[PDB]
Amino acid sequence: EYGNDNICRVLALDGGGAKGFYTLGVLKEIEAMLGCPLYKRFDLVFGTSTGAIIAALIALGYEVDQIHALYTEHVPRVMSSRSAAARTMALQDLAKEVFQDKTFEDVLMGIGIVATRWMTERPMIFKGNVVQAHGRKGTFSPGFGVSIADAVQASCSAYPFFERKVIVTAAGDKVELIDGGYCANNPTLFAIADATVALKKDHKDIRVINVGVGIYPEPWLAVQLLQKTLEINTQSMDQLRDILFKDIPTIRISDTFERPEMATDLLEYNLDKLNTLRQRGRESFGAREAQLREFLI
């Protein structure tokens, strides 16, 4: 609506597998209440694994309408690959068709993509502005001089199913990355650290609209431990956020479903089930409609 109001609204998108059709429904009930593309009422856009695709397109062009078509055309196909190498090939073509040649300079709003380094074991975060980092200024090239087609492709590669990406920075050093779900499945906490410390904002200035994908049921003792350890981090990171930044206006939109006919597998290639998740989630906004307009205006 208006131009500026000294209110920094951040957007943290979760993401994983085909279940990202949920947040496409939530984000569909929005951008109509507003009337403008979702980047016209936001200053930061964070996305870890599947919200990274939604993060880019929102940041460099088209609205949700188009995104949905680009998401139902290529994404349901890549999961339908019975080999780990085949999934990596279709993902490369996906990243090559929706992102042809645009890079981190053609981005319209502040964006941060989450990725994990396989050797240093600490997250890599692609940023797009000079005053966005906290240290080591100088030799700071937006997006490491990398193309967006290769930045998102790395941030979507789950190791046990995909292949580990190898990116060639502009400075000439090959980095071996994996998807940003292994370090932060929820970029909410990281998003607070940019507006607070880097952008130098007060503690009552920001409105954090966090959108998720939802919780769903299921269709060697190390395999159980992987699922258990990969859930403690996301929960503990959430609890930590509530203790540190308890005085920040936040709204989390991610509901839990318990019906047996709703259990997914994070890789469901069924257009006759992803459509239902797109529907259940258009109602999850209908319960907080009166509250979200206090944040977006």
Ligand X SMILES: Nc1ncnc2c1ncn2[C@@H]1O[C@@H]2COP(=O)(O)O[C@H]3[C@@H](O)[C@H](n4ccc(=O)[nH]c4=O)O[C@@H]3COP(=O)(O)O[C@H]2[C@H]1O
Of 124, 53, 66, which Cα lies nearest the Cα of 94?
A: 53
Q: Please list the alpha-helical segments (H only) found in 111-173.
A: 148-154
Contact set for a second copy, span 119-158 (CB under 8 A): 119-123, 134-136, 138-139
246 binds ligand X (CB under 6 A): no
In terms of DSSP bridges, do strands 44-47 and 8-13 run parallel, antiparallel, or are they unpaired?
parallel
- Which one-letter DSSP state was computed for residue 198? I
283 binds a second copy (CB under 8 A): yes
Q: Which of 272, 284, 291, 296 binds a second copy (CB under 8 A)?
A: 272
Is residue 236 among the annotated active site residues? no
CA dihedral 292, 42, 70, 278 (to 10 degrees): -10
Q: Which of 3, 203, 204, 290 binds a second copy (CB under 8 A)?
A: 290
State the nearest-atom distance from the C-beta of 250 to a second copy, in Å. Answer: 12
Helix (H) or strand (E) holding 116: strand 110-117
In terms of DSSP bridges, do strands 165-168 and 174-178 run parallel, antiparallel, or are they unpaired?
antiparallel
State the nearest-atom distance from the C-beta of 77 to ligand X, in Å. Answer: 29
Cα(274)–Cα(22) distance, integer angstroms: 8
Contact set for a second copy, span 78-97 (CB under 8 A): none
159 binds a second copy (CB under 8 A): yes
Is residue 179 among the annotated active site residues? yes
Question: With CB under 8 A, what is the number of residues at the site for a second copy?
Answer: 71
Cα(165)–Cα(144) distance, integer angstroms: 15
If contact means CB under 5 to 8 A according to the sort of partner, which of a second copy, ligand X, none does residue 217 touch?
a second copy
Residue among 85 and 223 whose Cβ is closer to a second copy? 223
- Which of these ranges, 12-20, 99-107, 141-149, 249-257, lies near a second copy under the rule CB under 8 A? 249-257
If contact means CB under 5 to 8 A according to the sort of partner, which of a second copy, ligand X, none does residue 24 touch?
none
32 binds ligand X (CB under 6 A): no
Contact set for ligand X, span 97-156 (CB under 6 A): 122-127, 133-137, 140-144
- 43, 179, 194, 284: the active-site residue: 179
Neighbours of 272 (CB within 10 A): 7
State the nearest-atom distance from the C-beta of 44 to a second copy, in Å. Answer: 15
Neighbours of 288 (CB within 10 A): 13
- Report the SS3 class of residue 124: strand
In terms of DSSP bridges, do strands 206-211 and 8-13 run parallel, antiparallel, or are they unpaired?
parallel
Contact set for a second copy, span 27-66 (CB under 8 A): 28-29, 32-33, 35
Cα(240)–Cα(233) distance, integer angstroms: 10
244 binds a second copy (CB under 8 A): yes
Of 210, 83, 103, 90, which Cα lies nearest the Cα of 150?
A: 103
Breaks following residues of the chain (C-to-N distance > 2.5 Å): 219
If contact means CB under 5 to 8 A according to the sort of partner, which of a second copy, ligand X, none does residue 196 touch?
a second copy
Q: Applying CB under 6 A, which residues contact ligand X?
A: 122-127, 133-137, 140-144, 190, 193-194, 239-240, 243, 286
Which sequence positions are flagged as catalytic? Answer: 49, 179
